[model samples]
Target: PRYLKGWLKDVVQLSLRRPSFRASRQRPIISLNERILEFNKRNITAIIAAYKRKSPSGLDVERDPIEYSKFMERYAVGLAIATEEKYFNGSYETLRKIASSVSIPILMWDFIVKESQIDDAYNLGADTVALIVKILTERELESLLEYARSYGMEPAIVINDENDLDIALRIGARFIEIASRDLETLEINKENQRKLISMIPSNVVKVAWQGISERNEIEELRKLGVNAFGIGSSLMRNPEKIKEFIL
Candidate 1:
């Protein structure tokens, strides 16, 4: 009955919250005709992670907010609003409005374990949704993605290990975020990135996350077929530095 209770709670929440799913689907696609074409040509895509927490290591705070905004301004091909338990007080709508105004593809980045959270993301105007492999069952993950697809929200699955990569492929994920911080060595990260890329469809976009500070690392990841890089600490330290580094 515990499982049933959980399921029932999700249903009740979904019923009470009719998120702006329809409105988000109807929102005009930002005319990125030229930008998309150019990005494809240059083989560069930017994924701005809208982090709310101070760095997990707590080494930097001064640049987190300013760098996040600057990253959005300079190279965010898409934006992901990162909401953790403490930084965001469940006011997803407010954050969504801010991200939408940025005029880039916006993704709700949270620990998506419940269907209700997915509904909340849709209501908040997220163009995309993130599913962390460590926190979901295979069945739950598949079902969640199916529901998101029905609402026209693209799914970007984050994989922290090889097993997660396998599950991602099985679920037909078109975009993947791989955290470099999880790897013990750059060589391992490169090998894993390549191995994962080879397993996925060619059209699927690969995004690398964490420990991306220097342009050399970006270029290195790009060489490994990574299309996007999630830069936080380094960029947060100096937003202008990112713009300069990328260029």
Candidate 2:
């Protein structure tokens, strides 16, 4: 019932002129993530994410959001924003600020569960979103993907477990991210991330997310057949260090 009204509002908003962010269509980064064999070439498609930081230790060194967007521009073909407003304390307003500043398409990294959130993201200036399979009904998953497309955004999904993996295979999403953290335990899983990576078919856009903070890990994941990497904290801390990783 809540979502029905939400869905209606989304439809009404459709007739309204949308904010078309000026980014290059030459690279539909999320769409390209699937076709990209690997980031082995100089012309690699990089999607480095950044967030308004509030890490476990404390706030992330008092960096400005606009400055972070500028940093993301230095080495990214695409950008992911951590928009969760809890432990991380993020939002659509944060995205609203960043989207206008960068020329690259922005991906919203959130635990989006409702059909309305798809429409909401478009208004928020998101070109992409993370559809966590664990948090959504199978029906909602399919519905929201289409909804995201309707609003000119690409839908991305995560795979951390067998069920998530199985549904991903069924849905055949173009871009699929495999993260290394267990949200319940908040544990880093380099080993388990590899295990989950094995579950995904090669044709899917295999993105290695989180727990990747080094250069050798990039080479190894590439050899493991990963098409892209979503490095947020590492890149934000020092874009110069991984600047080498940028093509």
Candidate 3:
């Protein structure tokens, strides 16, 4: 219900008005696909750490999001910025600031419900955007995927179950992120994640989001064929321990 409510909130927010940001010229394009393979070339697990100052799941960081992203810049292949303003306490300005400051690809992590949101993300400097499969109808999903590509930005399809995976694959999603955590309950489920991860086609780039904290966890997931990992809270809490995940 919480997740549903958040989606509703996003819809209402979009209905109210759209963001006033527009790109002046062609921003430098950083390909997230290339970055993941680059990490693999270096023999390191591709980690895309997130920058969210707060979350409904009790994630609260005191450091500036930009500073936090800069610290992870040395280690992570890319960055995921939580851009939802309500629950995550995130804003486009934060994303803009971090995008201007960092050289890596930025994934706009939000409950995106409109095309204008994608424009906002691109204009504000996001190389990729997260599109949750569960929230959108099949046609809506396909349209948004095409719309994102029209601007030359990759849309990462977020899926948690077999049904979502089917939708993602049917829509030709090249980037797939299998969720290991429940948004409503905030519970981690590695077993289910493993099942879904194996279901992803070998041609697509597989990213494991949430429930990843330690080295052993990532090692285990890597053995299952995960190409990248979207991690945030654990690294945000310690920051120094990122070295442990550098393998």
Candidate 4:
């Protein structure tokens, strides 16, 4: 029942209500695309390990955000930290801690719906921000994408269907992710990932988000033109599995 009935709207409403202020903050933006492509050149699968309160498997590993992120940086090409406070139980403080501590790119993974959120991400030291096409209108999506770039941060467009993909392509999205899980119903479906991923042009960096658990999955997706992946539960449950992903 929860997260099933308009969970996306719930997050958007929360995002709008939270007031953000300008601060004297500056952090060099890191390129998630460059990191992923570099790993591809070396034949290493680039994985963006996420730091959140709960995993998709219903498991929660209470590792310190900064320390855990440092560990992730050793293996992952990028670190994605949740910043939504209500549902994800994430905070910008944790984002700041991890961003300041880790050298690898950091993704501010949240239900971003405003320009202020992008500003928050930039000030908090995020190298990238997640902007789902399903959540924002075309105008909003294009505007936010530009806003993130103005601050020199990469805005990853998360697409779930053909319409989303069309918007992404038209909006000139350089970095796009084919989401394995639907944000609305929290459903996991890998069936259409191949077809959807195939639609994305090779010039654009294609990232597969969520539902990743093993080496075989990455191997298969890699053949289908996925330059990188976003993995959470699996690695969080067993940190040693990072060795399995790395060559």
Candidate 5:
């Protein structure tokens, strides 16, 4: 666990260098708007996820398509339309239409194991692309980002832990995704999140994704210092819930 411990140390050291760290020495600022503005200044962005199968934790997307589409249209800061399985029945053209029609920024959400998928993203009008750090080597990550950049698409990395963050940073990731589901427990998860937020460069946007539902949770995460969030199940459970949360 030294690698994890070392990552924690490195992130803490990195957090110490942030301008916000120097702004008010005795008091830590915590506001979603403040965090979002800081992240935008740092080029941090959010990802909207679309998955085909039901998540292991029991999220069901197959129950409602119109609700899903409407929810996506209204709430997501950005969209990551997934087309990974035959059962999910998603189409690139349909997702492209959604992206083109919607005002929000869109990324082609897929398991990007090859260059052909990158080309598909560009062809389908994706504004950004995601690569999972857990699944790729450092060299592959760098090469993919460079390749995506060559095609004028912004590249982002999805990470579930501290080690992933280190690899992400070393490979020149400008954006990172943090999911609440990855931690051993809720309290430790939140602590790890705080530490992770402290570690990323102020210029890199930290997107908190998965398992976020309550208004209090969102507000608390903001206080903990996350730039953006990806809310799926909470919003998808009921259309009115989305309206209520946004309001």
Candidate 6:
């Protein structure tokens, strides 16, 4: 299981746009969102646990809801909350609390492989959900997409390669992410980001998920047509990083 993230804004009142996107060939400015945990606030790498770690943290760091609300209020287009138990050490209550306190949409970053989980996220007031293309069959992907839509939950499809990317687009999602590492292997391939970005069609909002830390990497990825950036842990470990990027 893996956790991932992506877009939002202060634009107009969106009717299920959840950041309703673009199909034009013209590339746009990079949209960035901060992925949040239950106030544990670890560094970004420790969270993704890329490169095959001994095991993901067995403990979910308990964060003070008041401080976390303030932390997220700092500056970011959108927010993502880890909503799983085993992998990200997440809790539905945590996400629910944050969602109630923030106006920005919350992207539920969890291994959502089934229908009931989609309802779980919706029940928690999640505005978005992560759908890893690598985990589901083409049929399942489409089904999940429809199911998520039924409850009005947006899908941020996580893509590991060209195959995942192709299926994601075929299924037609408003949001798509090019993950920096394989979920199973935990190996990081920064270059794969570029390859997939080249393949993503215009209009659909694009995100750079996992394995990105430096401000420059985001700048570089933005130039390559990443419309949004999903960054976690780094902000948790060094909350100042948010100001560094947003400023």
Model 2 spans with C-alpha error above 4 angstroms: 1-42, 55-61
TM-scores across all candidates? 0.74, 0.78, 0.92, 0.94, 0.71, 0.74
Whole-model lDDT per candidate: 0.60, 0.65, 0.83, 0.83, 0.58, 0.60
lDDT of 1 by residue, 1-247 (tens): 0132332335334433434344343354332222333565776555454554453344344433434654575576665565443333224654555555566666676656667677667666667678766556788888888887777666778787778888888888777788654421223265665566555556677777766667776766567676677666665566555564466
Query: What does the lDDT read for residue 240 in candidate 4?
Result: 76
- Best of the two (3, 6) by lDDT: 3
After the best TM-score superposition of candidate 2, give how far the Cα of residue 197 lies from its true spot, in angstroms.
1.8
**Candidate 5 lDDT tens digits, 47-151:** 253533344345565534444665666554565565543323455665556555555556666556556667666666666677767555678778888887787
| lDDT (tens digit, per residue) of candidate 4 on 1-247 | 1122366677778888887868755558888878999998988889988888874336577777876777888889898898888777789898888888888889999878888888888889899899888888888889899999998877889998888899998998999989988877778789877779988987899999888878888898888999999887777777778778765
RMSD of candidates 1 onward, in order: 6.3, 6.8, 2.4, 2.6, 12.7, 11.8
Candidate 6: which stretches are off by over 4 Å?
A: 1-65
Give lDDT: candidate 3, residue 149.
Answer: 92
Cα distance off (Å), candidate 1, residue 129: 1.5
In terms of TM-score, how similar is model 6 to the real structure?
A: 0.74
Residue pairs whose backbone atoms clash in candidate 4: none
Tell me the lDDT of candidate 6.
0.60
Clashes of each: 1, 0, 0, 0, 2, 8
Positional deviation of 163 in candidate 4, in angstroms? 1.5
- The best-first sequence of candidates by TM-score reads 4, 3, 2, 6, 1, 5
Off by over 4 Å in 1: 1-38, 42-45, 55-71, 87-94, 182-201
Model 5 stretches with alpha carbons more than 4 Å out:
1-53, 63-72, 86-89, 183-191
Candidate achieving higher TM-score, 2 or 3: 3
Cα displacement (angstroms), candidate 6, residue 71, comes to: 2.2
Select the stronger candidate by TM-score from 3 and 5. Answer: 3
